[PDB]
Amino acid sequence: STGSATTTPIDSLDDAYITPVQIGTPAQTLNLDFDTGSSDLWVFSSETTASEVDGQTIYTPSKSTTAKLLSGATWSISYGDGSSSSGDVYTDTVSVGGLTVTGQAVESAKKVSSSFTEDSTIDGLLGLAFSTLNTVSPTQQKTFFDNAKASLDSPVFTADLGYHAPGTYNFGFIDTTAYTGSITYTAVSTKQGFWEWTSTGYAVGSGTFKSTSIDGIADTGTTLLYLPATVVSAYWAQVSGAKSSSSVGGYVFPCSATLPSFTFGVGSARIVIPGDYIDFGPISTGSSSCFGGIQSSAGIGINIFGDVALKAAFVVFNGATTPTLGFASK
Ligand SMILES: C[C@@H]1C[C@H](C)CN(Cc2nc(N)nc(N(C)C)n2)C1
């Protein structure tokens, strides 16, 4: 089996991407944020505290003939940005792009934090990191990908995110028409539950490539590229007027600037992030200070290859017995 679904930016900045997902019988279609940095599939639901729902589409398990309470199971998750959600759990049929899993754990939110309430376009998350991070207690649950894996033609999924445009998540096959050149594969550590890998270095604009190992995670659920302070300082030093602002919470730059590209290494291959991808626009409406798309990871405890990086590539998440990650230009 295979699946193929279009993923669409939620706003003009590509803050996140939503992918339609069919849950239950008859289908209830919710737009979920596919997140390779977490491992819970959770949804706004008929159980979500009413004051915490503001425009989202909800899953109503009582209207699904295939829903069953996973008795006694609860979940609670916190994300890197300080947001959180929690609730109880149903099993139900879940389909993505024509690929169906029966008995998928669908985590029904009873509570969500304000950032979730405020984002009317995101109806929940679909985690695609390793199932060892799943928060369901007392019986940990598997991700959609892990459940689907045995049925897939090949034990892989791919992320092809667009820059200010739709893109694609495929399950079970590699679309050889979706990238240019060859795919370079690199080793993954699953020790922290993430798609964790080591980049071989970087370049700023037309500058020379610096060979240096940068350990980080491929995280479709993080907007920006978070790298060591040394690397980030070297990038922003090439932009006149750029500075780190403690009041704003990161590097900002004059909106009149033209940003240089940023290259990261994957083995002996190179992925180039165009300068435009690093522009997140005014910090507030009408401001001439713009927020940068490359920020320091200092204090996070891990480097994060978020959407800014991933959208510059066709990315293969290879869930074979020994997982690997592949990157191609596109
Ligand atoms: C780190 C956060 C902190 C809050 C207070 C302001 N924002 C400004 C801002 N402006 C813009 N344009 N884009 C972003 N992000 C993509 C995160 N954020 C940065």
Curated annotation (Swiss-Prot):
GO terms for molecular function: aspartic-type endopeptidase activity. GO terms for biological process: proteolysis. Keywords: Aspartyl protease, Disulfide bond, Hydrolase, Protease, Signal, Zymogen. The keyword Hydrolase applies. This is Endothiapepsin. Its EC number is 3.4.23.22. Disulfide bonds join C255-C290. It catalyses: Hydrolysis of proteins with specificity similar to that of pepsin A, prefers hydrophobic residues at P1 and P1', but does not cleave 14-Ala-|-Leu-15 in the B chain of insulin or Z-Glu-Tyr. Clots milk. Residues 17-328 form the Peptidase A1 domain. It is an enzyme of class 3 (hydrolase). The chain holds residues 90 to 419 of 419 of the full protein. The active site is at D35, S199. Belongs to the peptidase A1 family.
